[model samples]
Target: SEWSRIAVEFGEQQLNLTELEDFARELAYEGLDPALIIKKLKETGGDDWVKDTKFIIVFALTRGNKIVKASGKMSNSGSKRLMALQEKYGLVERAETRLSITPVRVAQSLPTWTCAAAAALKEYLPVGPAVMNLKVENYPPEMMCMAFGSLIPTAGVSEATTKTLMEAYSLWQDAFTKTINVKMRGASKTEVYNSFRDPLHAAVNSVFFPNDVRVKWLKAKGILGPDGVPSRAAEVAAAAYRNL
Candidate 1:
Protein backbone atom coordinates (compact mmCIF):
# COMPACT_ATOMS: atom_id res chain seq x y z
CA SER A 1 0.00 0.00 0.00
CA GLU A 2 2.80 2.40 0.83
CA TRP A 3 4.60 1.58 -2.42
CA SER A 4 1.37 1.98 -4.39
CA ARG A 5 0.80 5.33 -2.77
CA ILE A 6 4.30 6.42 -3.58
CA ALA A 7 3.90 5.37 -7.18
CA VAL A 8 0.57 7.16 -7.51
CA GLU A 9 1.91 10.33 -5.95
CA PHE A 10 4.90 10.41 -8.27
CA GLY A 11 2.81 9.59 -11.32
CA GLU A 12 0.23 12.24 -10.48
CA GLN A 13 2.90 14.92 -10.40
CA GLN A 14 4.10 14.10 -13.94
CA LEU A 15 7.53 15.27 -12.93
CA ASN A 16 10.23 16.25 -15.41
CA LEU A 17 13.87 15.18 -14.93
CA THR A 18 14.96 17.97 -12.59
CA GLU A 19 11.84 17.60 -10.43
CA LEU A 20 12.55 13.89 -10.26
CA GLU A 21 15.99 14.72 -8.92
CA ASP A 22 14.46 17.01 -6.30
CA PHE A 23 11.95 14.33 -5.36
CA ALA A 24 14.76 11.86 -4.79
CA ARG A 25 16.76 14.42 -2.82
CA GLU A 26 13.81 15.22 -0.57
CA LEU A 27 13.20 11.52 -0.07
CA ALA A 28 16.90 11.22 0.81
CA TYR A 29 16.55 14.01 3.35
CA GLU A 30 13.74 12.01 4.94
CA GLY A 31 16.15 9.08 5.51
CA LEU A 32 15.41 7.12 2.37
CA ASP A 33 18.55 6.13 0.46
CA PRO A 34 18.37 7.01 -3.25
CA ALA A 35 19.84 3.64 -4.24
CA LEU A 36 17.56 1.65 -1.99
CA ILE A 37 14.54 3.79 -2.91
CA ILE A 38 15.15 3.07 -6.58
CA LYS A 39 15.56 -0.60 -5.79
CA LYS A 40 12.28 -0.65 -3.92
CA LEU A 41 10.60 1.41 -6.66
CA LYS A 42 11.59 -1.24 -9.16
CA GLU A 43 10.73 -4.22 -6.95
CA THR A 44 7.21 -3.02 -6.25
CA GLY A 45 6.11 -0.54 -8.88
CA GLY A 46 6.02 -2.70 -12.07
CA ASP A 47 6.74 -1.74 -15.69
CA ASP A 48 5.42 1.80 -16.18
CA TRP A 49 6.77 2.82 -12.81
CA VAL A 50 10.13 1.32 -13.57
CA LYS A 51 10.22 3.08 -16.93
CA ASP A 52 9.80 6.55 -15.43
CA THR A 53 12.17 5.71 -12.59
CA LYS A 54 14.90 4.71 -15.02
CA PHE A 55 14.53 8.02 -16.86
CA ILE A 56 14.88 9.85 -13.56
CA ILE A 57 17.95 7.79 -12.84
CA VAL A 58 19.41 8.89 -16.17
CA PHE A 59 18.90 12.54 -15.25
CA ALA A 60 20.18 11.96 -11.74
CA LEU A 61 23.40 10.44 -13.01
CA THR A 62 23.89 13.32 -15.45
CA ARG A 63 23.23 15.96 -12.84
CA GLY A 64 25.35 14.10 -10.29
CA ASN A 65 28.26 13.94 -12.68
CA LYS A 66 28.13 17.68 -13.27
CA ILE A 67 28.30 18.27 -9.52
CA VAL A 68 31.13 15.81 -9.19
CA LYS A 69 33.09 17.45 -12.00
CA ALA A 70 32.55 20.93 -10.64
CA SER A 71 33.76 19.78 -7.23
CA GLY A 72 36.86 18.19 -8.84
CA LYS A 73 35.74 14.71 -7.89
CA MET A 74 35.32 13.65 -11.54
CA SER A 75 37.17 14.35 -14.79
CA ASN A 76 35.87 16.51 -17.62
CA SER A 77 35.98 13.46 -19.81
CA GLY A 78 33.69 11.59 -17.42
CA SER A 79 31.17 14.44 -17.24
CA LYS A 80 31.35 14.95 -20.97
CA ARG A 81 30.72 11.28 -21.63
CA LEU A 82 27.62 11.20 -19.44
CA MET A 83 26.03 14.11 -21.29
CA ALA A 84 27.05 12.61 -24.59
CA LEU A 85 25.35 9.40 -23.54
CA GLN A 86 22.19 11.33 -22.81
CA GLU A 87 22.26 12.93 -26.26
CA LYS A 88 23.05 9.68 -28.00
CA TYR A 89 20.13 7.95 -26.37
CA GLY A 90 17.76 10.86 -27.16
CA LEU A 91 17.23 11.64 -23.46
CA VAL A 92 18.27 15.24 -24.11
CA GLU A 93 15.58 15.57 -26.80
CA ARG A 94 13.01 13.97 -24.52
CA ALA A 95 14.06 16.14 -21.59
CA GLU A 96 14.00 19.32 -23.70
CA THR A 97 10.43 18.52 -24.79
CA ARG A 98 9.37 18.80 -21.13
CA LEU A 99 9.96 22.56 -21.50
CA SER A 100 9.59 23.14 -25.22
CA ILE A 101 6.97 23.66 -27.94
CA THR A 102 6.13 19.99 -28.07
CA PRO A 103 4.48 17.54 -30.48
CA VAL A 104 1.09 18.54 -29.09
CA ARG A 105 1.68 22.21 -29.90
CA VAL A 106 2.85 21.27 -33.37
CA ALA A 107 -0.41 19.37 -33.91
CA GLN A 108 -2.64 22.05 -32.35
CA SER A 109 -1.10 24.58 -34.74
CA LEU A 110 -2.68 22.60 -37.57
CA PRO A 111 -6.03 24.37 -37.16
CA THR A 112 -4.19 27.67 -36.83
CA TRP A 113 -2.31 26.92 -40.03
CA THR A 114 -5.50 25.97 -41.82
CA CYS A 115 -7.09 29.21 -40.68
CA ALA A 116 -4.16 31.22 -42.05
CA ALA A 117 -3.79 29.23 -45.31
CA ALA A 118 -0.26 28.38 -44.32
CA ALA A 119 -1.82 24.93 -44.41
CA ALA A 120 0.26 23.33 -47.14
CA LEU A 121 3.65 23.42 -45.45
CA LYS A 122 5.31 20.46 -43.78
CA GLU A 123 5.73 22.21 -40.46
CA TYR A 124 1.98 22.83 -40.16
CA LEU A 125 0.75 19.87 -42.15
CA PRO A 126 -0.09 16.83 -40.04
CA VAL A 127 -2.36 15.11 -42.51
CA GLY A 128 -3.00 11.36 -42.73
CA PRO A 129 -0.55 8.49 -42.13
CA ALA A 130 2.31 10.35 -43.77
CA VAL A 131 2.11 13.35 -41.48
CA MET A 132 5.41 15.04 -40.70
CA ASN A 133 5.51 16.32 -37.15
CA LEU A 134 8.33 18.73 -36.37
CA LYS A 135 9.33 20.03 -32.94
CA VAL A 136 10.17 23.70 -32.53
CA GLU A 137 12.91 22.90 -30.01
CA ASN A 138 14.61 20.64 -32.53
CA TYR A 139 14.63 23.39 -35.15
CA PRO A 140 17.15 26.17 -35.46
CA PRO A 141 16.14 29.73 -34.58
CA GLU A 142 16.71 30.81 -38.17
CA MET A 143 14.27 28.14 -39.37
CA MET A 144 11.56 29.51 -37.09
CA CYS A 145 12.42 33.01 -38.26
CA MET A 146 12.09 31.81 -41.82
CA ALA A 147 8.78 30.14 -40.99
CA PHE A 148 7.48 33.32 -39.36
CA GLY A 149 8.56 35.25 -42.45
CA SER A 150 6.65 32.90 -44.72
CA LEU A 151 3.51 32.79 -42.60
CA ILE A 152 3.10 36.56 -42.41
CA PRO A 153 1.51 37.65 -45.68
CA THR A 154 2.25 40.94 -47.46
CA ALA A 155 -1.53 41.07 -48.08
CA GLY A 156 -4.74 39.08 -47.28
CA VAL A 157 -5.13 38.43 -43.49
CA SER A 158 -5.85 41.83 -41.88
CA GLU A 159 -3.09 43.96 -40.45
CA ALA A 160 -4.79 43.18 -37.11
CA THR A 161 -4.98 39.48 -37.94
CA THR A 162 -1.39 39.46 -39.12
CA LYS A 163 -0.17 41.46 -36.18
CA THR A 164 -2.18 39.41 -33.69
CA LEU A 165 -1.02 36.06 -35.05
CA MET A 166 2.55 37.25 -35.39
CA GLU A 167 2.61 38.66 -31.90
CA ALA A 168 0.81 35.73 -30.29
CA TYR A 169 3.00 33.10 -31.91
CA SER A 170 6.13 35.07 -31.09
CA LEU A 171 5.03 35.47 -27.48
CA TRP A 172 4.26 31.78 -27.24
CA GLN A 173 7.68 30.91 -28.64
CA ASP A 174 9.42 33.60 -26.63
CA ALA A 175 7.81 32.14 -23.52
CA PHE A 176 9.47 28.80 -24.25
CA THR A 177 12.84 30.43 -24.87
CA LYS A 178 12.50 32.56 -21.77
CA THR A 179 11.43 29.58 -19.70
CA ILE A 180 14.57 27.69 -20.65
CA ASN A 181 16.96 30.64 -20.59
CA VAL A 182 15.70 32.40 -17.47
CA LYS A 183 12.54 31.25 -15.65
CA MET A 184 13.56 27.60 -15.51
CA ARG A 185 17.03 28.35 -14.21
CA GLY A 186 17.43 26.78 -10.75
CA ALA A 187 13.76 25.68 -10.74
CA SER A 188 11.77 22.50 -11.05
CA LYS A 189 11.36 21.96 -14.82
CA THR A 190 7.87 20.46 -14.65
CA GLU A 191 6.63 23.16 -12.29
CA VAL A 192 7.85 25.88 -14.63
CA TYR A 193 6.44 23.95 -17.57
CA ASN A 194 3.02 23.57 -15.93
CA SER A 195 2.92 27.27 -15.11
CA PHE A 196 3.75 28.21 -18.71
CA ARG A 197 1.31 25.99 -20.62
CA ASP A 198 -1.92 27.84 -19.87
CA PRO A 199 -0.66 31.34 -20.68
CA LEU A 200 1.14 30.17 -23.79
CA HIS A 201 -1.92 28.30 -25.06
CA ALA A 202 -4.13 31.30 -24.36
CA ALA A 203 -1.84 33.61 -26.34
CA VAL A 204 -1.63 31.25 -29.32
CA ASN A 205 -5.34 30.46 -29.30
CA SER A 206 -6.21 34.18 -29.39
CA VAL A 207 -5.19 34.12 -33.05
CA PHE A 208 -6.92 30.91 -34.04
CA PHE A 209 -9.54 31.03 -36.81
CA PRO A 210 -13.26 31.98 -36.47
CA ASN A 211 -12.33 33.81 -33.26
CA ASP A 212 -10.22 36.23 -35.35
CA VAL A 213 -12.43 37.53 -38.16
CA ARG A 214 -9.56 39.14 -40.01
CA VAL A 215 -7.98 35.75 -40.57
CA LYS A 216 -11.44 34.30 -41.31
CA TRP A 217 -12.02 36.89 -44.01
CA LEU A 218 -8.54 36.34 -45.46
CA LYS A 219 -9.41 32.65 -45.70
CA ALA A 220 -12.81 33.49 -47.22
CA LYS A 221 -11.04 35.54 -49.91
CA GLY A 222 -8.71 32.59 -50.68
CA ILE A 223 -5.48 34.40 -49.93
CA LEU A 224 -2.58 32.16 -48.97
CA GLY A 225 0.10 33.88 -46.94
CA PRO A 226 3.57 34.62 -48.35
CA ASP A 227 5.36 31.70 -50.05
CA GLY A 228 2.39 29.37 -49.29
CA VAL A 229 0.65 27.15 -51.85
CA PRO A 230 -2.06 24.52 -51.69
CA SER A 231 -1.07 20.88 -51.62
CA ARG A 232 -4.52 20.01 -52.95
CA ALA A 233 -4.41 23.11 -55.15
CA ALA A 234 -7.70 22.73 -57.06
CA GLU A 235 -9.66 21.63 -54.02
CA VAL A 236 -8.18 24.25 -51.67
CA ALA A 237 -8.32 27.09 -54.23
CA ALA A 238 -11.92 26.34 -55.27
CA ALA A 239 -13.34 25.78 -51.80
CA ALA A 240 -14.86 28.52 -49.63
CA TYR A 241 -13.31 28.93 -46.21
CA ARG A 242 -15.77 29.23 -43.31
CA ASN A 243 -15.17 26.99 -40.30
CA LEU A 244 -12.44 24.82 -41.83
Candidate 2:
Protein backbone atom coordinates (compact mmCIF):
# COMPACT_ATOMS: atom_id res chain seq x y z
CA SER A 1 0.00 0.00 0.00
CA GLU A 2 2.99 2.29 0.57
CA TRP A 3 3.90 1.73 -3.03
CA SER A 4 0.43 2.74 -4.06
CA ARG A 5 0.63 5.83 -1.94
CA ILE A 6 4.12 6.71 -3.13
CA ALA A 7 2.96 6.12 -6.65
CA VAL A 8 0.03 8.47 -6.32
CA GLU A 9 2.05 11.16 -4.62
CA PHE A 10 5.37 11.20 -6.47
CA GLY A 11 4.64 9.22 -9.64
CA GLU A 12 1.32 10.67 -10.66
CA GLN A 13 1.86 14.22 -9.50
CA GLN A 14 5.29 15.60 -10.30
CA LEU A 15 6.72 13.76 -13.28
CA ASN A 16 3.77 13.35 -15.62
CA LEU A 17 3.78 9.61 -14.92
CA THR A 18 0.26 9.34 -16.23
CA GLU A 19 1.32 10.72 -19.62
CA LEU A 20 4.29 8.36 -19.79
CA GLU A 21 2.05 5.47 -18.84
CA ASP A 22 -0.49 6.50 -21.43
CA PHE A 23 2.28 6.72 -23.99
CA ALA A 24 3.39 3.24 -23.08
CA ARG A 25 -0.16 1.93 -23.30
CA GLU A 26 -0.95 3.34 -26.72
CA LEU A 27 -4.18 1.63 -27.76
CA ALA A 28 -6.20 2.81 -24.77
CA TYR A 29 -5.30 3.82 -21.23
CA GLU A 30 -6.45 1.94 -18.15
CA GLY A 31 -4.24 1.65 -15.08
CA LEU A 32 -1.18 3.50 -13.79
CA ASP A 33 2.12 2.40 -12.27
CA PRO A 34 4.52 3.88 -9.77
CA ALA A 35 7.43 2.57 -11.81
CA LEU A 36 7.71 5.81 -13.74
CA ILE A 37 8.16 7.73 -10.52
CA ILE A 38 10.58 5.06 -9.33
CA LYS A 39 12.47 5.38 -12.58
CA LYS A 40 12.63 9.13 -12.41
CA LEU A 41 13.61 9.10 -8.78
CA LYS A 42 16.38 6.63 -9.48
CA GLU A 43 17.53 8.58 -12.48
CA THR A 44 17.57 11.95 -10.75
CA GLY A 45 18.42 10.91 -7.16
CA GLY A 46 15.37 12.87 -6.20
CA ASP A 47 13.50 13.66 -2.95
CA ASP A 48 11.17 10.70 -3.24
CA TRP A 49 13.94 8.11 -3.01
CA VAL A 50 13.79 6.51 0.41
CA LYS A 51 16.95 4.46 0.83
CA ASP A 52 15.59 1.60 2.98
CA THR A 53 12.12 1.08 1.55
CA LYS A 54 11.44 1.14 -2.15
CA PHE A 55 8.29 0.76 -4.17
CA ILE A 56 7.53 -0.64 -7.58
CA ILE A 57 4.18 -0.80 -9.30
CA VAL A 58 4.07 -2.21 -12.79
CA PHE A 59 0.72 -2.24 -14.54
CA ALA A 60 -0.45 -3.27 -18.00
CA LEU A 61 -2.99 -1.55 -20.27
CA THR A 62 -5.34 -2.76 -22.97
CA ARG A 63 -8.09 -1.80 -25.34
CA GLY A 64 -11.50 -3.42 -25.52
CA ASN A 65 -12.82 -4.88 -28.76
CA LYS A 66 -12.03 -1.66 -30.58
CA ILE A 67 -9.38 1.03 -30.16
CA VAL A 68 -9.95 4.72 -30.60
CA LYS A 69 -7.61 6.16 -33.22
CA ALA A 70 -6.73 9.65 -34.45
CA SER A 71 -9.12 9.20 -37.32
CA GLY A 72 -12.58 10.13 -36.08
CA LYS A 73 -14.21 7.25 -37.90
CA MET A 74 -12.10 4.71 -36.01
CA SER A 75 -12.96 6.00 -32.56
CA ASN A 76 -15.72 4.02 -30.86
CA SER A 77 -17.29 5.24 -27.63
CA GLY A 78 -18.87 1.87 -26.88
CA SER A 79 -15.52 0.14 -26.94
CA LYS A 80 -14.00 2.73 -24.64
CA ARG A 81 -16.87 2.29 -22.22
CA LEU A 82 -16.47 -1.48 -22.30
CA MET A 83 -12.75 -1.13 -21.63
CA ALA A 84 -13.72 0.78 -18.50
CA LEU A 85 -16.01 -2.06 -17.44
CA GLN A 86 -13.31 -4.65 -18.10
CA GLU A 87 -10.81 -2.72 -15.98
CA LYS A 88 -13.32 -2.02 -13.23
CA TYR A 89 -14.16 -5.70 -12.95
CA GLY A 90 -10.54 -6.89 -13.32
CA LEU A 91 -11.46 -8.59 -16.56
CA VAL A 92 -8.50 -6.90 -18.25
CA GLU A 93 -5.15 -5.48 -17.33
CA ARG A 94 -3.21 -2.81 -19.17
CA ALA A 95 -6.39 -1.11 -20.27
CA GLU A 96 -4.12 0.91 -22.51
CA THR A 97 -2.46 -1.05 -25.32
CA ARG A 98 -0.62 1.98 -26.64
CA LEU A 99 2.87 0.60 -26.28
CA SER A 100 4.46 1.11 -29.64
CA ILE A 101 6.83 -1.35 -31.20
CA THR A 102 8.49 1.85 -32.39
CA PRO A 103 10.70 3.74 -29.97
CA VAL A 104 10.23 7.49 -30.18
CA ARG A 105 12.61 8.38 -27.36
CA VAL A 106 16.37 8.54 -27.76
CA ALA A 107 16.95 6.01 -25.00
CA GLN A 108 14.75 3.47 -26.76
CA SER A 109 16.12 4.32 -30.21
CA LEU A 110 19.86 4.17 -29.55
CA PRO A 111 21.42 1.16 -31.30
CA THR A 112 23.81 0.28 -28.48
CA TRP A 113 21.15 -0.94 -26.10
CA THR A 114 18.94 -4.02 -26.30
CA CYS A 115 15.96 -1.69 -26.00
CA ALA A 116 16.53 -0.84 -29.64
CA ALA A 117 15.51 -4.37 -30.42
CA ALA A 118 12.03 -3.28 -29.47
CA ALA A 119 10.52 -5.51 -32.10
CA ALA A 120 13.35 -5.01 -34.55
CA LEU A 121 12.80 -7.63 -37.28
CA LYS A 122 16.14 -7.31 -39.05
CA GLU A 123 16.99 -11.00 -39.27
CA TYR A 124 13.44 -11.99 -40.11
CA LEU A 125 12.07 -9.23 -42.28
CA PRO A 126 12.54 -7.08 -45.31
CA VAL A 127 12.56 -3.55 -43.89
CA GLY A 128 10.48 -2.12 -46.68
CA PRO A 129 7.43 -4.18 -45.95
CA ALA A 130 7.55 -3.30 -42.27
CA VAL A 131 7.85 0.37 -43.08
CA MET A 132 5.05 0.20 -45.61
CA ASN A 133 2.67 -1.79 -43.47
CA LEU A 134 3.39 0.31 -40.40
CA LYS A 135 2.31 3.37 -42.33
CA VAL A 136 -0.97 1.72 -43.23
CA GLU A 137 -1.62 0.32 -39.74
CA ASN A 138 0.44 -0.43 -36.67
CA TYR A 139 2.09 -3.81 -37.23
CA PRO A 140 0.14 -6.27 -35.14
CA PRO A 141 2.39 -8.69 -33.23
CA GLU A 142 1.29 -11.72 -35.25
CA MET A 143 1.90 -9.79 -38.44
CA MET A 144 5.22 -8.67 -37.07
CA CYS A 145 6.09 -12.28 -36.33
CA MET A 146 5.07 -13.36 -39.80
CA ALA A 147 7.01 -10.54 -41.43
CA PHE A 148 10.04 -11.35 -39.32
CA GLY A 149 10.12 -14.92 -40.62
CA SER A 150 10.55 -13.65 -44.16
CA LEU A 151 14.13 -12.47 -43.73
CA ILE A 152 15.29 -15.62 -42.01
CA PRO A 153 17.17 -18.11 -44.16
CA THR A 154 15.29 -20.97 -42.56
CA ALA A 155 12.27 -19.34 -41.00
CA GLY A 156 13.84 -19.09 -37.55
CA VAL A 157 13.73 -22.80 -36.85
CA SER A 158 15.47 -26.13 -37.47
CA GLU A 159 15.24 -27.83 -40.85
CA ALA A 160 12.85 -30.49 -39.61
CA THR A 161 10.73 -27.86 -38.00
CA THR A 162 10.91 -25.89 -41.21
CA LYS A 163 9.61 -28.85 -43.17
CA THR A 164 6.70 -29.31 -40.85
CA LEU A 165 6.11 -25.61 -40.81
CA MET A 166 6.23 -25.46 -44.56
CA GLU A 167 3.61 -28.14 -44.88
CA ALA A 168 1.45 -26.37 -42.35
CA TYR A 169 2.10 -23.08 -44.07
CA SER A 170 0.93 -24.40 -47.37
CA LEU A 171 -2.29 -25.66 -45.90
CA TRP A 172 -2.96 -22.62 -43.75
CA GLN A 173 -1.81 -20.14 -46.34
CA ASP A 174 -4.17 -21.69 -48.83
CA ALA A 175 -6.91 -20.67 -46.48
CA PHE A 176 -5.20 -17.66 -44.91
CA THR A 177 -3.33 -15.86 -47.67
CA LYS A 178 -6.33 -15.63 -49.92
CA THR A 179 -7.98 -13.11 -47.60
CA ILE A 180 -5.72 -10.05 -47.70
CA ASN A 181 -4.54 -8.33 -50.86
CA VAL A 182 -1.54 -6.08 -51.20
CA LYS A 183 -0.06 -5.33 -54.59
CA MET A 184 3.55 -4.23 -54.92
CA ARG A 185 6.14 -3.68 -57.67
CA GLY A 186 8.45 -6.17 -59.45
CA ALA A 187 9.77 -8.52 -56.82
CA SER A 188 7.18 -6.74 -54.76
CA LYS A 189 7.85 -6.75 -51.06
CA THR A 190 4.33 -8.02 -50.62
CA GLU A 191 5.13 -11.09 -52.71
CA VAL A 192 8.24 -11.74 -50.67
CA TYR A 193 6.22 -11.30 -47.49
CA ASN A 194 3.63 -13.78 -48.75
CA SER A 195 6.30 -16.37 -49.41
CA PHE A 196 7.44 -16.08 -45.81
CA ARG A 197 4.24 -15.37 -43.82
CA ASP A 198 2.65 -18.33 -45.55
CA PRO A 199 4.99 -20.67 -43.69
CA LEU A 200 6.01 -19.04 -40.41
CA HIS A 201 2.63 -17.81 -39.25
CA ALA A 202 0.20 -20.24 -40.81
CA ALA A 203 2.68 -23.10 -40.60
CA VAL A 204 4.65 -22.72 -37.38
CA ASN A 205 1.68 -21.60 -35.32
CA SER A 206 -0.53 -24.20 -36.86
CA VAL A 207 2.07 -26.86 -36.18
CA PHE A 208 4.04 -25.74 -33.14
CA PHE A 209 2.34 -22.93 -31.22
CA PRO A 210 0.50 -24.49 -28.35
CA ASN A 211 -2.82 -23.20 -27.10
CA ASP A 212 -1.11 -22.74 -23.78
CA VAL A 213 1.41 -20.34 -25.31
CA ARG A 214 -1.38 -18.28 -26.81
CA VAL A 215 -3.23 -18.20 -23.54
CA LYS A 216 -0.18 -17.21 -21.53
CA TRP A 217 0.87 -14.59 -24.04
CA LEU A 218 -2.56 -13.04 -24.10
CA LYS A 219 -3.01 -13.06 -20.34
CA ALA A 220 0.48 -11.73 -19.71
CA LYS A 221 -0.33 -8.77 -21.91
CA GLY A 222 -3.73 -8.41 -20.23
CA ILE A 223 -5.37 -8.62 -23.62
CA LEU A 224 -7.64 -11.56 -23.02
CA GLY A 225 -11.38 -11.01 -23.23
CA PRO A 226 -13.87 -11.90 -20.50
CA ASP A 227 -14.11 -15.34 -22.07
CA GLY A 228 -10.30 -15.72 -21.85
CA VAL A 229 -10.01 -15.44 -25.61
CA PRO A 230 -7.75 -13.12 -27.56
CA SER A 231 -10.66 -12.22 -29.78
CA ARG A 232 -8.96 -9.18 -31.35
CA ALA A 233 -5.76 -11.05 -32.09
CA ALA A 234 -7.57 -14.03 -33.59
CA GLU A 235 -9.68 -11.77 -35.73
CA VAL A 236 -6.61 -9.95 -37.02
CA ALA A 237 -4.82 -13.22 -37.66
CA ALA A 238 -7.79 -14.55 -39.61
CA ALA A 239 -7.96 -11.39 -41.68
CA ALA A 240 -4.24 -11.55 -42.35
CA TYR A 241 -4.61 -15.12 -43.52
CA ARG A 242 -7.39 -14.29 -45.92
CA ASN A 243 -5.28 -11.59 -47.58
CA LEU A 244 -2.19 -13.73 -47.60
Give the top-scoring candidate (TM-score): 2
Whole-model alpha-carbon lDDT for candidate 2 = 0.33
Taken over the whole model, the C-alpha lDDT of each candidate is: 0.35, 0.33
Weakest 10 consecutive residues of candidate 1 by summed lDDT: 126-135
Task: Give model 1's TM-score versus the native structure.
Answer: 0.20
TM-score of each: 0.20, 0.25
Top lDDT: which candidate number?
A: 1
lDDT tens digits, residue span 1-244, model 1: 9999999898797548998898865544111122333344445446654454343333332232133243354467745754543343322222132223211222223333332323333242222112111222212121121123233343443455444444433433443444335655465534554554444434333333234443343344343343232222212212211111
Count of clashing pairs, candidate 2: 22
Scored against the true structure, residue 202 in model 2 reaches a CA lDDT of 33
